[PDB]
Write a protein that binds this DNA or RNA. Structure first.
Lengths: 156, 225, 259, 212, 129
RNA sequence: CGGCCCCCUGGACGAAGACUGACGCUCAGGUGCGAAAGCGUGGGGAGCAAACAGGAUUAGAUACCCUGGUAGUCCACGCCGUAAACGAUGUCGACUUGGAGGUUGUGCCCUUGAGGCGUGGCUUCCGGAGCUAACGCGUUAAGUCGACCGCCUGGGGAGUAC
RNA sequence: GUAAAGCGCACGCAGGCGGUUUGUUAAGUCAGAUGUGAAAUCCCCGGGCUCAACCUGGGAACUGCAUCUGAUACUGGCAAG
């Protein structure tokens, strides 16, 4: 039921007395096609093991997101370290207008319709984190009604 | 259940000095006496009662309780308390990642159990002396570390702690896993990670004992229920 | 309610700062630490050497009560300054009692003049005296049976520096530190001074009205350099020391202990 | 392996080997997902047990909290909506719809026993309409019992039992201030009418004395 | 020097929400009062209370729902350096209608929705979410 | 900006009161002050010391080290207008958990003692939330905001040429 | 702050911004109307060339400007505090 996308894999080095020890980092993200989403960032000497780790970690530390039907509930900004992200709810049919790692996380999240730009850095890791942050902070109409002591129709 | 007079007698109301406090504890502080913080018993009591009730409820559903104190003044007492209600405890140094990294520690438990078996049930004696001394030493080490939690099986369903600042590693583990935390929190301590805080003197022995005894009684009650 | 506020001020009313109210019940003994609880934030790590009387064995079991001392709080965890100092207040009260009738009567046995004046000891403690006070007249207890028993009749006290000289015999007979710092001066006046803190080059014995002495590291013993003062004497103990040197200007009285 | 390293809280295993094997499991909230790990990639590990000892209908339920959530989870794999409760023998009265009852009940002697041990006690699969039918068969009876409680005039009793929730059967232990809101509450008399019901209970005990 | 009182208000509120302060006090002004009233109506705060004769002090009481604050965001829009005036058609929607935009109009200060209903625009004071 | 004294003189802070009644903040151009070195004229010249000379060292030593040593450093009056002129952090105002100090006021308190409880100004260190690329900053912000100005737009060429 | 980027420091004209209360005005602001904003082009609904491009009817738009009539919370002006 869960869908999982390996966003990126990158070779990283550690210099030692002999020479360079190489290793691999795997950035993955998983989601159930609904509110729930989680990213994982694994590391191992070989690629498949590292992606396996990324999947494991993602499967843990999952986070829920309040989706109005296929899209978002309102425009939302999210940042992390360099990657600053804007994403905006959009009409059915438009699809996921987003670039790169961001796209991936959106798809697994089960959002189908967004207009979305990544300002600043586009370092996959940071940008996916920023996306997750923007999705988490985003609140729903019912939530704001509750926050504020009102009915949904009062807020419209 | 536990009265205010008794707590006063114990020395709960006493709290750390005025240069060592935490401003998140400002609500729980009443005043400062001889440049020493006083804990507000009026606000402490009801919450302590609450915490007791929650612990009882946990017990009723057959919850596993872990008693943590590594202050080495009240290690004996926390062990005694754990045993009275036949629950589990960590009276010596908490192993970093005992709960988060359970699966590894579970092997540790198993090795300890095997060693215990060898010692007692086998009755095999006839072991090379140095080797026998080494095995004995290993047994002692593992008993000290994991004696209380050996029969635990899996992960506790609640975590009682005697000091938050001292056992912050355990607290953090519980939070990461989501285990309910029941902490005694002096003025210097940080109660943010704690779910059911308890403002009381972690240091004084009699106060610690009192805390323990009430907790044990309510666990026993929940078991009876 | 105000129950608690009234209690807080009540409990203020029923304790004081110094070691005055004998309140701490000895709730655990083990060698070499006694512990009490005088209604303080924590229990005191008491030495055994505050509580053995005059021949080297303990005297108080569980439940027993002595007050300790205060006005210093939490070096990182704990509570007190020790209780024998409390006993010093009782000794001071006994000494003051003399004033009422102009005669304090105890036993006082003064064999030899440490710093000019015979040393007189009251039950547990031993205090040092100025010369005249040991004897009412030139009688000179050196010809008396050693460590003889008479009493103490006060000849001289310094009234800020605990130097008290008393008259053993003859029952019938009946700023501030630094301007005139020439009393313990001349070359070699020995003193009874409690050490305060050993700074790994020193010991800091300093008793005589707000001064500072250093018996630092060189004498202390009859070994020079491998000594490490903490091993060789004590913490908080009244000892043999004498001046050997005074600055009145740069306030460095450099005592010694090899004597 | 998660279960082995204390990561998948597995309490009871109310399953019938040789047919269906549905079992719920809890977990410490830490992005673990218990059923997910038990299933795997497209039922990877699920297929293993499926063709393990023999073709079995193994099922996993995401345990929520306490026994109330265990009821619905024991009705899976199906569609539970509501359930009734009691004391020692609560008897989880499954409340579903006929259309979904076909799969929920599955087989007369199969899912009625497999889901019976699920909670450890026993379940009584019913219908949405059945619930209401029995629901009303309870309102009339704290009244449907020849009215052997308080009793005064009947014309006032009808207007009182109109607004009265759960008749008057032992209702004095409930809020004794909301019936005073009723149009007509001078001196404590209705608060006294409930006392009459209490006396009626004592009278019922006297009837027990008449029979014991 | 103090140049924008309203903005100072909003910053105070923001800081109180951040610091979990129960109530936030500051010197009173009519526009400030009206803004506070609007917020209360829109439920971002519990209650506001002006007190004093010579130099009265507005005191707002801040709102906290499940631990975290109610006023998720609060920005000035108009400011002394650069004023913003909006016509009724052009009026904004804060957080896609979930938040509000305080707007001063000829008929008083009101939320953006209220202004739209009335059929008039004006100076956009602040967004609140 | 550092020995004492005197004469003339600017600012700061506190204590209470009394008064004025928005007179405020910022500031392109403009004006002033602006280390050291440097320049001009006139004085002065102990010590030190660019330049210079010799002796060493060295492969060489137009240096480092040694012996000497003149401009200058000092004073008066002019000019110069730059420095890692740095907190590498524009000015003014408001708001946001704490601890340990220093310094300088001041209110009360039995100063019963060097103290006890406050309340102002300036100031050093540590550290929370928050912020930050991180380092770190952290009520003296690099946090949360407002007002005005200054400045940046790849490295070199070049802060150079005209 | 360290990546480029806080004038060495100040005073200060012009300029920018401006505590709080009442009154007034109505300049800014907002609302409505009138006049205009060529046609074509763009966009919406239609029609015609077999379709399309293309042609074409009606609308919308042309975010503006000018006026007149209102509104007066805010900003401004004026008057008193």
């Amino acid at each position: 039921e869960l869908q999982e996308k390996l966003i990126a894999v990158n070779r990283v080095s550690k210099t030692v007395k002999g020479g360079r020890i190489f290793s691999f980092t795997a950035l993955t993200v998983v989601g159930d096609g609904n509110g729930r989403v989680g990213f994982g960032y694994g590391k191992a000497r070989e690629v498949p093991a590292a992606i396996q780790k990324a999947m494991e970690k993602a499967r843990r530390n999952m986070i829920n997101v309040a989706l109005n039907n296929g899209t978002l509930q309102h425009p939302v900004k999210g940042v992390h370290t360099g990657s600053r992200v804007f994403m905006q709810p959009a009409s059915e049919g438009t699809g996921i207008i987003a670039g790169g790692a961001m796209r991936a996380v959106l798809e697994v999240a089960g959002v189908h319709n967004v207009l979305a730009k990544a300002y600043g850095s586009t370092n996959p890791i940071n940008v996916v984190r920023a996306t997750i942050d923007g999705l988490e902070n985003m609140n729903s109409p019912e939530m704001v009604a509750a926050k504020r002591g009102k009915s949904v129709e009062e807020i419209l | 259940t536990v009265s205010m007079r008794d707590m006063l007698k114990a020395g709960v109301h006493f709290g750390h000095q005025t240069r060592y406090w935490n401003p998140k504890m400002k609500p729980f502080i009443f005043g400062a006496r001889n440049k020493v913080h006083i804990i507000n018993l009026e606000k402490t009591v009801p919450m302590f009662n609450e915490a007791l009730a929650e612990l009882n409820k946990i017990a009723s559903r057959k919850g596993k309780i872990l008693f943590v104190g590594t202050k080495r003044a009240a290690s004996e007492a926390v062990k005694d308390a754990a045993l009275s209600c036949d629950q589990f405890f960590v009276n010596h140094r908490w192993l970093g990642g005992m709960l988060t990294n359970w699966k590894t520690v579970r092997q540790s438990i198993k090795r300890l159990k095997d060693l215990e078996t060898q010692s007692q049930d086998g009755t095999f004696d006839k072991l090379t002396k140095k080797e026998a001394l080494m095995r004995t030493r290993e047994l002692e080490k593992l008993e000290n570390s994991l004696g209380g939690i050996k029969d635990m099986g899996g992960l506790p369903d609640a975590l009682f702690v005697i000091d938050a600042d001292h056992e912050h590693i355990a607290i953090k583990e519980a939070n990461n896993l989501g285990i309910p935390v029941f902490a005694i929190v002096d003025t210097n301590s940080d109660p943010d990670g704690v779910d059911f805080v308890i403002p009381g003197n972690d240091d004084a022995i009699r106060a610690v004992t009192l805390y323990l005894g009430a907790v044990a009684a309510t666990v026993r009650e929940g078991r009876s229920q | 309610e105000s129950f608690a506020q009234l209690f807080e001020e009540s409990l203020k009313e029923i304790e004081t700062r110094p070691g005055s109210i004998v309140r701490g019940v000895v709730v655990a003994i083990d060698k070499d630490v006694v512990l009490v609880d005088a209604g303080l934030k924590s229990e005191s790590a008491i030495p055994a050497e505050q509580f053995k009387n005059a021949q080297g064995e303990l005297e108080i079991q569980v439940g027993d009560e002595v007050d300790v001392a205060l006005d210093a709080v939490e070096d990182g965890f704990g509570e007190t300054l020790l209780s024998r100092e409390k006993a010093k207040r009782h000794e001071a009260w006994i000494t003051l009692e003399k004033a009422y009738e102009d005669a304090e009567t105890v036993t006082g046995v003064i064999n030899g003049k440490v710093k000019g004046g015979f040393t007189v000891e009251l039950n547990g403690i031993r205090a040092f005296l100025p010369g005249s006070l040991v004897d009412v007249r030139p009688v000179r207890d050196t010809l008396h049976l050693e460590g003889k028993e008479l009493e103490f009749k006060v000849i001289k006290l310094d009234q800020k520096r605990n130097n008290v000289v008393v008259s053993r015999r003859a029952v019938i007979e009946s700023e501030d530190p630094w301007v005139a710092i020439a009393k313990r001066y001349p070359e070699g006046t020995k003193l009874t001074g409690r050490v305060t803190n050993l700074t790994d080059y020193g010991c800091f014995v300093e008793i005589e009205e707000g001064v500072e002495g250093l018996v630092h590291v060189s004498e202390m013993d009859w070994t020079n350099k491998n000594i490490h003062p903490s091993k060789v004497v004590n913490v908080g103990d009244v000892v043999e020391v004498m001046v050997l040197d005074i600055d009145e200007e740069r306030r460095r009285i450099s005592l010694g202990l090899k004597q | 392996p998660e279960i082995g390293e204390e990561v998948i809280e597995i309490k009871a295993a109310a399953r019938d080997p040789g047919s269906r094997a549905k079992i719920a499991v809890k977990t410490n909230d830490k992005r673990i997902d218990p059923v997910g790990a038990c299933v795997g990639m497209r039922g990877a590990r699920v297929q293993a047990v499926s063709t393990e000892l023999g073709g079995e209908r193994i099922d996993i339920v995401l345990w929520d909290d306490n026994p109330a959530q265990f009821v619905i989870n024991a009705m899976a794999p199906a569609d539970v909506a509501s359930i009734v409760v009691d004391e020692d023998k609560h008897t989880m009265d499954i409340a579903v719809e006929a259309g979904n009852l076909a799969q929920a009940i599955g087989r007369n002697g199969q899912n009625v026993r497999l889901a019976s041990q699920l909670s450890g006690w026993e379940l009584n699969v019913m219908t949405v309409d059945d619930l209401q039918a029995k629901h009303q068969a309870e309102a009339h009876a704290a009244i449907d019992t020849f009215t052997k409680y308080l009793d005064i005039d009947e014309d006032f009793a009808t207007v009182l039992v109109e607004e009265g929730f759960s008749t008057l059967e032992e209702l004095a232990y409930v809020p004794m201030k909301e019936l005073l809101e009723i149009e007509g509450l001078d001196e404590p008399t209705v608060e006294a009418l409930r006392e009459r019901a209490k006396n009626a209970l004592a009278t019922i005990a006297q009837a027990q004395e008449e029979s014991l | 020097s103090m140049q924008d009182p309203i903005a100072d208000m909003l910053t105070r509120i923001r800081n109180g929400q951040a610091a979990n302060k129960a109530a936030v006090t500051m010197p009173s002004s009519k526009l400030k009062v009206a803004i506070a009233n609007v917020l209360k109506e829109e439920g971002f705060i519990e209650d506001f209370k002006v007190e004093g004769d010579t130099k009265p002090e507005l005191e707002l009481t801040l709102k906290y729902f499940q631990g975290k604050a109610v006023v998720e965001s609060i920005q000035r829009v108009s400011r002394p350096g650069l004023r913003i005036y909006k016509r009724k058609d052009e009026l904004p929607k804060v957080m896609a209608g979930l938040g509000i935009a305080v707007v001063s109009t000829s008929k008083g200060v009101m939320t953006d929705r209220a202004a739209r209903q009335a059929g008039l625009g004006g100076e956009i004071i602040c967004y609140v979410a």
